[PDB]
Write a protein that binds this ligand. Structure first.
Ligand SMILES: Nc1ncnc2c1ncn2[C@@H]1O[C@H](COP(=O)(O)OP(=O)(O)O)[C@@H](O)[C@H]1O
Ligand code: ALF
Length: 395
């Protein structure tokens, strides 16, 4: 699939060597562009960062928290930069010349400046960002973190030239497309409440697949995913294989998407993966076992295997977990649901409020039939922060 003109504008400018921030509608094409950029930019200098576990596996690796070798905190630059200045953190900090980032919406502001001086102090250069080709990407109308990074003082002073993307590539029908922006900008008519309310009835989930529901908080999804599991009668089959070399919670927590324990039963809904398939990106599925041999849509069932999820712990050092790429569907968490293109989802709008959670949830659904909104979006669902002002001064 050839790139749009809007996209290829970004490609050439990063190839030029310029720090370039570009933003885009949910499904603008943003994160696919970095797939071409990372293929375009040359190993040895590129780091492939992001702000969640799930954002880094879509792209390359490393989750900012991890790569920087720090975890925000009230440690001034001093401890931070000294914590930045151990081996693995340094050696990796020094060699990079182009630092891609993704899902910048989530990174707090203070993290940026603290990350900022840290980048300079290690490299010793007093260029804007330690003189890194600093690529950035994300949409601030999706999930917040307060104080997004553009409020940070390093921002703009890093000299990023702001670019924009349009023509949403994920949803084909303009009727659905026009919907999200109405929600995105925080504007709800009935023709922004009734198209969906109408839909609530839908049946979603082709064959054996079920609607992967989305939730406001992480705990419900932990419970709701599992309650369904114990309910399903059959072989427990909870093999897992948390084969982590140390005994550290953080590696399987932040910096990778894994749970140490994968209680995969006989027929519960297994969703997501690690891409690396011509026909299977990150879609939900289930089937019989012999080695899960899981069937998702597309009608493609093959045998699934566990791999390596390399991580850099804080203060240097590398821990790695070796678990299966799959995770339990049934109810995906919404904050973990950025950077996702989900064919079939279902969400309850009514108690799910936060400058974005509305937008972010539905927008991750290709076509309207997949989206299984529930409780009427009686306005209030669509809340907004007035960050639109920043996108508004983008004359
Ligand atoms: N230039 C392009 N060529 C092919 N597919 C694209 C392009 N731009 C966007 N897409 C589609 O958009 C999806 C990725 O959406 P993306 O913009 O990365 O999500 P988000 O905007 O939420 O980060 C992919 O499935 C891909 O097929
Ligand atoms: F803006 Al995105 F996944 F990068 F919705």
């Amino acid at each position: 699939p050839q790139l749009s003109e809007e996209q290829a504008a970004v490609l050439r400018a990063v190839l030029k060597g310029q720090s370039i921030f570009f933003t885009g509608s949910a499904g603008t094409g943003k994160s696919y562009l970095l797939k071409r950029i990372l293929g375009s930019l040359p190993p040895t200098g590129t780091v492939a960062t992001a702000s969640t576990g799930v954002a880094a596996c879509h792209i390359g690796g490393t989750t900012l928290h991890a790569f920087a070798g720090i975890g925000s905190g009230q440690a001034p630059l001093a401890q931070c930069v000294a914590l930045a200045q151990r081996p693995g953190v340094r050696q990796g900090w020094l060699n990079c010349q182009r630092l891609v980032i993704d899902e910048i919406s989530m990174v707090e502001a203070d993290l940026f400046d603290k990350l900022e001086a840290v980048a300079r102090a290690v490299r010793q250069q007093n260029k804007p960002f330690g003189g890194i080709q600093l690529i950035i990407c994300g949409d601030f109308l999706q999930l917040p973190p307060p104080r997004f990074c553009f409020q940070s003082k390093s921002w703009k002073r890093c000299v990023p030239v702001t670019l924009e993307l349009t023509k949403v590539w994920r949803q084909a029908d303009q009727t659905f497309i026009s919907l999200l922006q109405a929600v995105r900008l925080g504007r709800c008519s009935d023709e922004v409440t009734r198209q969906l309310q109408a839909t609530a009835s839908h049946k979603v989930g082709r064959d054996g697949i079920v609607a992967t529901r989305l939730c406001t908080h992480q705990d419900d999804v932990a419970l709701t995913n599992e309650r369904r599991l114990q309910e399903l009668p059959g072989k427990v089959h909870r093999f897992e294989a948390m084969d982590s070399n140390p005994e550290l919670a953080s590696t399987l927590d932040a910096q990778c998407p894994v749970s140490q324990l994968l209680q995969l039963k006989l027929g519960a809904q297994v969703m997501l993966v690690k891409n690396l398939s011509v026909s299977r990106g990150l879609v939900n599925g289930a089937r019989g076992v012999v080695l899960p041999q899981v069937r998702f849509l597309c009608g493609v069932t093959e045998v699934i295997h566990a791999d390596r999820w390399t991580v850099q712990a804080t203060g240097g050092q590398l821990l790695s977990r070796q678990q299966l790429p799959l995770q339990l569907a049934w109810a995906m968490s919404i904050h973990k649901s950025q950077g996702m293109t989900l064919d079939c989802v279902e969400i309850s709008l009514g108690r799910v409020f936060a400058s974005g959670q509305a937008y972010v949830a539905l927008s991750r659904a290709r076509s309207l039939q997949g989206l299984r909104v529930l409780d009427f979006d009686p306005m209030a669902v669509r809340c907004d922060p007035r960050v639109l002002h920043f996108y508004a001064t983008l004359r």
